[PDB]
Write a protein that binds this DNA or RNA. Structure first.
Lengths: 68, 70, 84, 145, 108, 126, 136, 25
RNA sequence: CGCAAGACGGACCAGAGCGAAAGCAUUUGCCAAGAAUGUUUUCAUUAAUCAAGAACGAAAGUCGGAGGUUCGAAGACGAUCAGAUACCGUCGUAGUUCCGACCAUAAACGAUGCCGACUGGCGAUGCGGCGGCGUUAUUCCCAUGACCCGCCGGGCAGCUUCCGGGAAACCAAAGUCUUUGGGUUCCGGGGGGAGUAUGGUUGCAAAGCUGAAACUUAAAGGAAUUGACGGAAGGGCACCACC
């Protein structure tokens, strides 16, 4: 009725980098492992320069990337 | 694909028998004994072969009881 | 074609497997036959492509059947050409 | 059809089939074969069954087609009606259902048409109960006995 | 008058008229023999959501159904969506379909 | 980065290995000093390159034969494969028999020995 | 909110009726029969912009609420029926089909079955747009 | 389209001449 | 969840089939018609192409009735634009459908007359006939079914090349042409003026068919080749480009 009830702050880590996307190469596709489930994996779009094995701070895993 | 839990062969086999068809109910039973389901004796393979050889002798098919036992 | 081949004298059936009006002499591809089954104990003579029912005078009253070409006989042997 | 003290009793109304199964069987280089009949039971129930057949991709074709003549098809349709009227005109409402659950009906057609073209697949994609008789409480409770 | 293609860009042989089909994207009328036909078989569920659906499903091993869509494109929509590309004079004679993955197993 | 070797290096590198195969080691420094004595390379930086490629080739020449240049011992083993192979000395195993329709040819050409019969089924792919 | 008097080892199965395509997403949870029903939420109610009504997160945010009121009542499991628009139209799912499932499943609700249902003609009336169709 | 229009403007013009001559008599 | 109305035959449906062409896909029956193949049947030159004349002939349109779901010229609105009588969104008449009369036109395109003869190779597909080592159906066994292999007709097409031709693109025909002649019909003469003028004819209407000149001009046009250009496609690159 009022506002919303939301999920708590998640943490998920890179397994591999895929390639860069966006219309100036500013976005980066990446595969990430959920860091609580080792068989779960989602693809994301991440802005900043990333290497591999570093951890992110996802606000949701409802969202999922495709290409555009 | 086909089947799963190879135990479904009995169900069909049983379903066709309530109509009175032992020619296809059996076929379904044989379609399993010979297939990817060669996991050497799951516990359900005995009731399959017991029904299979009952129908073989209920219609008279030795060359099928041979392949079944083989 | 090897572009030098003979045409005077052809092979017995490797150059007489051709269509019958594309041969050097025109031959039929049909024949007669002397029959005499039991259903009708008589020496009947019948053409290979019957085109019509051939009748019998015995217990039977049918011998042939006209299909789309040759003719399907029956349970009675009786066969010959003879010669042609 | 009836309510009885917080328990709702049911009655047959007709069967249908999924989409994906019906779609997956349909494919290029086959000839689809279809027919229906209107049919009456021994009782007052009336049904309108819809069946289907598909041609077989044959034993050891090197050909990339499985198409059939038009003459051959109209035989297969005629013989698919003949079977499905014999087994449903006789044999009351419940015995119909009993034959369709393992699919004995469809399997019987597959072998009976085998000589004039082998065929793999027979299913009854729909049945539509069109008319039905009176409630008949005595006949009703037989089903829930 | 120069003839770019022996087939005039369609599969009409020994026939006077062919029923038109509507393009899936732009609704334009296109002859059934000129339309670019793509059969798309997809799982109803996307590969990422398969795990969550298997964990929440009451059945231990549910076989997920497939969507069967026959897409019909006009030539313009098929070029814009990059379904068909421009080919050289010689490579237009080639009718081999481009190789896809390999096969319908696993990753693709 | 970059620094893909030019043709001037790859031309003379092959030549220098063919005619001074023996002098080569597999160390950089030794292969440098040899190239300095068996030829003059008019630059210093050029010399440091041609040595390094001569080294990199000599690694592969100690495996199977290179297809850009020849050495003597490979043409030895070439000759040794190409004058007898250990597989046969017999022709082919001395007796091989054939199936009919070949026998009919041989019947009409005065031969009538060393045959078998099998009359394999009809037909192509069937 | 009063549920049934047992659901301890069994589940109660509703039907989810997810709607697909563009400019709209519905999620409308009903009975097994579908005769009567419960809450019904749209992506135009979660997000107001008249252009994010078909977006993934708008479909997820919808089902993230609807799935609460299910379990609040006693509906714990869901059979799923899909609907793309069809009727000689696009006849292909929108974006917010994949989306809502991923969100509602992980919220805690069980999934029982899933299927495609779309109204597909056996050839029917002419489609809006004319012979030359839309351009620009 | 261009030629099909040039044939059309001259069609309506021809029709007008017919009417105008039929009007004159 | 049930009912009504009108429209329409998906996927299956293909360089597949049938028809003179225009065209022709739900079931079952009836009515007449036709091609190909088979034949040691019949007739005995009965043929080929065509002024006159004749039948059929998409869609739109016209006249009189029925019907009118859907789409929709016209028209009324909402946006976009300096302008926007447009592209886009909403509504919507005629029309779209059926019955009976008219209208004779299309990129009615293979932009390729019809009939006949001769001249390469190869693999397929639809139909008929014939020949065959075998699997396969059933009643247990050569009824005729499916699959395999080969052969003979005519049909829609494809691949291949120093057949030969062509300006080239291309084409086993557009080939067998200065080494020119198998038979026959129709039709063309630089570009505009003009399918206009005019008279004839047909039509209820809309128009169709038949069809000039005065005057003007040295180019119009084809393939074909090389460049440049593209709000064409695929790769690659730059802080004088961007992030």
């Amino acid at each position: 009725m009022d506002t919303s009830r939301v999920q708590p702050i998640k943490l998920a880590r890179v397994t591999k980098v895929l390639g860069r996307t966006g219309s100036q190469g500013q976005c980066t596709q990446v595969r990430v492992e959920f860091m609580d489930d080792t068989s779960r994996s989602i693809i994301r779009n991440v802005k900043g320069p990333v290497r591999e094995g570093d951890v992110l701070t996802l606000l949701e895993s409802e969202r999922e990337a495709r290409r555009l | 694909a086909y089947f799963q839990r190879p135990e479904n062969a009995l169900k069909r086999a049983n379903e066709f028998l309530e109509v009175g068809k032992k020619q296809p109910a059996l076929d379904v039973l044989y379609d399993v004994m010979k297939s990817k389901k060669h996991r050497t004796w799951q516990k359900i393979h005995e009731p399959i072969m017991l029904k299979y050889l009952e129908l073989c002798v209920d219609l008279r098919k030795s060359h099928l009881a041979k392949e079944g036992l083989y | 074609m090897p572009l030098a081949k003979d045409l005077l004298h052809p092979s017995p059936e490797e150059e007489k497997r051709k269509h019958k009006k594309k041969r050097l002499v025109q031959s039929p591809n049909s024949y007669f036959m002397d029959v005499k089954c039991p259903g009708c104990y008589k020496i009947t003579t019948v053409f290979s492509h019957a085109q019509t029912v051939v009748l019998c005078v015995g217990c039977s009253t049918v011998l042939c059947q006209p299909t789309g070409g040759k003719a399907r006989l029956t349970e009675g042997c009786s066969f010959r050409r003879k010669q042609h | 059809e009836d309510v009885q003290g917080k328990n709702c009793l049911t009655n047959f109304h007709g069967m249908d089939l999924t989409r994906d199964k019906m779609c997956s069987m349909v494919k290029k280089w086959q000839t689809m074969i279809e027919a229906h009949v209107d049919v009456k039971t021994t009782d007052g129930y009336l049904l309108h069954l819809f069946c289907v057949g598909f041609t077989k991709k044959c034993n050891n074709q090197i050909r990339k087609t499985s198409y059939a003549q038009h003459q051959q098809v109209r035989q297969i349709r005629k013989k698919m009606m003949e079977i499905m009227t014999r087994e449903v005109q006789t044999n009351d409402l419940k015995e119909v259902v009993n034959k369709l659950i393992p699919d004995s009906i469809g399997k019987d057609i597959e072998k009976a048409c085998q000589s004039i073209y082998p065929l793999h697949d027979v299913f009854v994609r729909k049945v539509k109960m069109l008319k039905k008789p009176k409630f008949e409480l005595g006949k009703l409770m037989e089903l829930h006995g | 008058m120069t003839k770019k293609r022996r087939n005039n860009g369609r599969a009409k042989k020994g026939r006077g008229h062919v029923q038109p089909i509507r393009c899936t994207n732009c609704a334009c009328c296109v002859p059934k023999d000129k339309a670019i036909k793509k059969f798309v078989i997809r799982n109803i569920v996307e590969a990422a959501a398969v795990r969550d659906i298997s964990e929440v499903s009451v059945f231990d091993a549910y076989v997920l159904p497939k969507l069967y869509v026959k897409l019909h494109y006009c030539v313009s929509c098929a070029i814009h969506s990059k379904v068909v590309r421009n080919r050289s004079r010689e490579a237009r004679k080639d009718r081999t379909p481009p190789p896809r993955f390999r096969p319908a197993g696993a990753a693709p | 980065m970059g620094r893909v070797r030019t043709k001037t290096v790859k031309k003379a590198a092959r030549v220098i290995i063919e005619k001074y195969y023996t002098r080569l080691g597999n160390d950089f420094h030794t292969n440098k000093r040899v190239c300095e004595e068996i030829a003059i390379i008019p630059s210093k930086k050029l010399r440091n390159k041609i040595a390094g490629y001569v080294t990199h080739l000599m690694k592969r020449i100690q495996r199977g034969p290179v297809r850009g240049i020849s050495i003597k011992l490979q043409e030895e083993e070439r000759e040794r494969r190409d004058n007898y192979v250990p597989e046969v000395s017999a022709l082919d195993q001395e007796i091989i028999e054939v199936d009919p329709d070949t026998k009919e040819m041989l019947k009409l050409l005065d031969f009538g020995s060393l045959s078998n019969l099998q009359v394999t089924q009809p037909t192509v792919g069937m | 909110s009063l549920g049934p008097q047992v659901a301890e080892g069994e589940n109660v199965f509703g039907v989810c009726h997810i709607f697909a395509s563009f400019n709209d997403t519905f999620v409308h949870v009903t009975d097994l029969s579908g005769k009567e029903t419960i809450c019904r939420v749209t992506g135009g109610m979660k997000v107001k912009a008249d252009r994010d009504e078909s977006s993934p997160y708008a479909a997820m945010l919808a089902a993230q609420d609807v799935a609460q009121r299910c379990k609040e009542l006693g509906i714990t499991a869901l059979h799923i029926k899909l609907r793309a628009t069809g009727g000689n139209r696009t006849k292909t799912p929108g974006p917010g089909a994949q989306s809502a499932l991923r969100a509602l499943a992980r919220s805690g609700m069980k999934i029982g079955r899933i299927e495609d249902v779309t109204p597909i003609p056996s050839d029917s009336t002419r489609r809006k747009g004319g012979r030359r169709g839309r351009r620009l | 389209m261009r030629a099909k229009w040039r044939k059309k403007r001259m069609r309506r013009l021809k029709r007008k001449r017919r009417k105008m001559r039929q009007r004159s008599k």
